[PDB]
């Protein structure tokens, strides 16, 4: 407004002073905040009540996962298979090297940090456990024979226990297909679909830098050809719930599949 | 109009095909009725109610709320090309904008309907009639049936039916107090006095009242062609100006709009630099310009203006527009009509002369003033001569209406005497019916006296009272003794001369002096049963005994003399605009206070100094009386110089249009003018004024329809309420708007940062809507229930060009200081709530792409935990619900700090404003219900929130209290230039 050039400087200095005063208050507030935060354990973790279930290959055209392909055209499933492979490039024998061979089936509870630089020990998972649904001996993960291999992973919540009685198991089945068409026949690798109970509790990336989630794979044998089907993969465990209507990805993953020959 | 009173009866009765003796024909009079229409003023021909609500939808704030809604809908197209999600937020925001404008308009329409109906609950729907001579027969018809050229008979107490030319008349006197301001009853004769029909005597006017006499005339004009009609229709041509509050709201919507354009342009340029596409950067520009718009400020302003109209209604003052509630506090000049508005327009007895003393009476209606000596022997005789010699009588069943307001059947002179006897004595008619009337001679020019011979109460006195009244010099030529101090002394040259010095003193004040004389008749010369005669006088028409003098005038109204004083002590300049002759104007200007005591005109200095008025320098005079004849000879420059040079002004013999010129000149010079009025002579100049006040009982329908304020009780004291309340709201709206304005930046900066740092969205639209249209209405409306921060009624009138409702200091403070603190509180609570649930501040930077991606159901946090879209959507809703409470808890401080602008809260009192504290409680209660009611997580975007984050912003709230208290003590303790120029709102 040019009321007075000389007075402009004094009120400009007042405004910069006000802002830096409140900025210092704000900076002190964020630093006292961060000093109140434990780095291995979430302070509240309110919304992480029950876990999410995620699927590979992940292809959403619209309105959810829609994986449609033609077995006689390599271009329709090469991307699917490559996403699987580049996903499992960190589930590689010599890339999971930072963890330890885990033979304790019931649990892996660790109260003290016993790894370099005050880190903890982590459990191991290589691609071998997915015996058929691996690059060995099929680099197509079952997609070239109309028996696709879909790999199911559970989301990690710090010090979350899914139930000690048995291990969480993925039952993948047809959704609203009670017709003369037969149930979805699935061969799961690891067998019986069990996520081993020694990959719980997760203690945080700072505590377990090399931790990698367990995986299960479903070889979908019975899937009919040239038919759009829908499949729901539900994880059955005590602390896992699949009835959430505001999170369709809670303890379950649903996908549309069309194998065209 | 000029060539209708100048004609001869021969030419008139050919013009209108009528006769001065036989009247119109039943046939032609029913033809002219269908040609010229009814003899009624034409009501406004247009009143569509849909175009009545449409006008309520239009305003400056409404225009901004309209253009911003259009911007929102255009955004819902730019964001529909590129298909986006949760986009229905724009639809809610725009619909809420339009909804606010609609419902506030509905409120305004309803509260104007209420006012109009109340103003019509006092109006007279009784048909006014006339006596018509048609085909030679006198019958009574409705005035709307009269046609041009009809023979009309007028009687005392009859409203004149049309615009009439007097063909014959016997002592006819009419009250042209609507057309002119002539308080003094005006005589109508069948002969041409002037040619301007306003000052000639052969013409009677449409809505004038025949005070006394009898007349017969020819209707020369009916309808909107009467003087009434053309003045009221000229009042249609003049166009009302914008109310001052409207201009200030428009300047406010200039400020917020310019700020919005600057903000949006800055961040549009910045967004293009960051790397956003032109289309999406422009959507964000639109978002900024909408964020500056206040959703609910129109609602709170309307509610405040309604709450200060309810008060004024309870003080018997009704406003038509809600905008009038402020307009009297910005007023600098008040223009007032002398008759009716300032006076009572009722001849009452003012003074008396008996026992060689000029007694003065109570001229008021409340009878507040002091009456006179009512114990002398002379007074009882005077109160008998004035009581008995009065052929007038009150109408029936008025024994509950106050004596002044009662309707009397009698002359202008006799009505005041009857009301005087009623107030001073009581039961005047019953007292008069204790002394029969043997003989009377009321109205003859040869005798010039009302004679009445009565018989005394007691039969102990067969003596006969002879009471007669008339012009004092017609009385004294017939009296021989004077009643003084319990004696009948003779009329020396001294007593005659003192009577003359009283007649010429009580008649120099502009009063109707009347003299009363009496005599007691013998029981022997005139035994009970004497047969009196008039042709051959057999009673004494001479040798009477003088009783006293009684003088009547048009008195000032009760509360006026103090009302103009309390107005003037507020810096308001009171000017008078009357059509009455100058002497009456000066008298009722000195009495009421427009002309200060000890102030003299240039014509008075020329009598003090006995100098020609030319040599008397004008600047040495602080008062002036300017006639219409010399206001028509005066150019604009002369008016401006004469107006400022003489501070106290009285305008005399003005016309409808000359008043309009005065108001126009004062407004052009930079004043907010207010016109107080009654009668059709003020309907022109009541429209152009910024506020037009009309007397609700004594005012004509034209001045009550072309007004903005109606005083139902005719209490001129309501004006001195309308200022102070009107002032308060200004100062109490400057506060309210300020508070609401602060909410823009603590709402904008989230979004401004949600794009600038790409943090997850802190605050959503469904929540800023709840902030603006639910939580911040009760506080701001409460801010108007506050009390004065000074002697508001002694402060000089606010300067239009310097002192404004919203100025740059106010908006700059409310945004950049206070709302910045609020934004910091929100950011602290945002980073805190996120870090407690797994998202550290550094990770929040740049996370919005993956936060809002519908395809990532395994996003990993700072602790390494993996979240789906729904889980972190609920957590985003938590950021919403904590920024919400951050703002509301940081504004519980705002309402308190803005309850005062100079004084501290301790001095005024924290809890002194009750509605403020009720609103604070309601704010927190609505917050708790919204967060912890089952289902609000998905009905709206509010969820149960931990009780640690309620208290993170409280330090900030106390910082607000501390900061405003220090910056308010800075102005009060040190009224220095620095703080007041830079840090005072
Ligand atoms: C002050 C503010 N405005 C918004 C806002 C959104 C979210 C948070 N917002 C905040 C905190 C979105 O729903 C939209 O971009 C919306 C919008 C879009 C275009 C034009 C006008 C408004 N504006
Ligand atoms: C499993 O444990 C064996 C020892 O039994 C050790 O070689 C290694 O940790 C794991 N096996 C392989 C092949 O790496
Ligand atoms: C899995 O692989 C083994 C050997 O590689 C084979 O015998 C078996 O049939 C395979 N299962 C399916 C379902 O193809
Ligand atoms: C699958 O691919 C082959 C060759 O690419 C094509 O001939 C065939 O029609 C495809 N199947 C369908 C159902 O279109
Ligand atoms: Mg009047
Ligand atoms: Rb970017
Ligand atoms: Rb806003
Ligand atoms: Rb008196
Ligand atoms: Rb007006």
Numbering used by the authors:
A (entry chain B): 30 to 290
B (entry chain A): 49 to 1033
What text comes from the article?
The gastric H+,K+-ATPase mediates electroneutral exchange of 1H+/1K+ per ATP hydrolysed across the membrane. Previous structural analysis of the K+-occluded E2-P transition state of H+,K+-ATPase showed a single bound K+ at cation-binding site II, in marked contrast to the two K+ ions occluded at sites I and II of the closely-related Na+,K+-ATPase which mediates electrogenic 3Na+/2K+ translocation across the membrane. One of the notable differences between HKA and NKA is the presence of Lys791 and its salt bridge partner Glu820 in HKA, which physically restrict K+-binding space at the site I position. In this work, to elucidate the molecular basis of the different K+ stoichiometry in these two pumps, we evaluated a series of NKA-mimetic mutants of HKA with increasing substitutions.
Accordingly, we introduced a Glu936Val mutation within the triple mutant and determined its crystal structure and Rb+ anomalous scattering. In marked contrast, only in the quadruple mutant, is Rb+ density at the cation-binding site significantly stronger than that at the P-domain at higher contour levels. Consequently, we conclude that the crystal structure of the HKA quadruple mutant is obtained as a mixture of one Rb+- and two Rb+-bound protein molecules in the crystal lattice.
